[PDB]
């Protein structure tokens, strides 16, 4: 399913080219801006670790998830990828532990040295 679907299929959007964060366009957006950093953007999005064992959604607190895009206000893996999106797309992004909360985890909500999936929508982006 969708996160060995993203390591066999993803996109590297990398600068190194190192596969930390690797993407599928799940469906296409409008238009051919996409958000420049400092941006204020709004998302829905569902989440995991790679394993499965822990799951997460926007749709738990019943609104879309606002920040500011390459302000460092979420994972390096979510500033490099949602700067990738166009307004309306839907991505699947699979990360590796250095786009995340690395060696050192962020307990007890994730381990160290996880790997994260997201599906993500790109809701809308304005320049805050
Ligand atoms: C480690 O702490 C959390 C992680 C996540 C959700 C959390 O609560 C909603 C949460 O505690 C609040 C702090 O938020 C951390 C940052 C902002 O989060 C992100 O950078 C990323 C990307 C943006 C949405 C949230 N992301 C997460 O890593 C989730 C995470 C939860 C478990 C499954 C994998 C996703």
């Given at each position: 399913?969708?996160?060995?679907?993203?390591?066999?299929?993803?996109?590297?959007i990398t600068s190194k080219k190192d596969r930390g964060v690797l993407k599928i366009v799940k469906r296409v957006?409008?238009?051919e801006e996409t958000p420049?950093?400092?941006?204020?953007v709004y998302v829905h999005y569902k989440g995991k670790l790679s394993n499965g064992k822990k799951f997460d959604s926007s749709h738990d607190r019943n609104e879309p998830f606002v920040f500011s895009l390459g302000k460092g206000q979420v994972i390096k893996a979510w500033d490099i990828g949602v700067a990738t999106m166009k307004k309306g797309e839907i991505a699947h992004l699979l990360i590796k532990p250095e786009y995340a909360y690395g060696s050192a985890g962020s307990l007890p909500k994730i381990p160290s040295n996880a790997t994260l999936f997201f599906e993500i929508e790109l809701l809308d982006f304005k320049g805050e």
């Open positions: 399913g969708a996160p060995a679907t993203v390591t066999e299929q993803g996109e590297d957006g409008n238009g420049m950093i400092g941006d204020k």
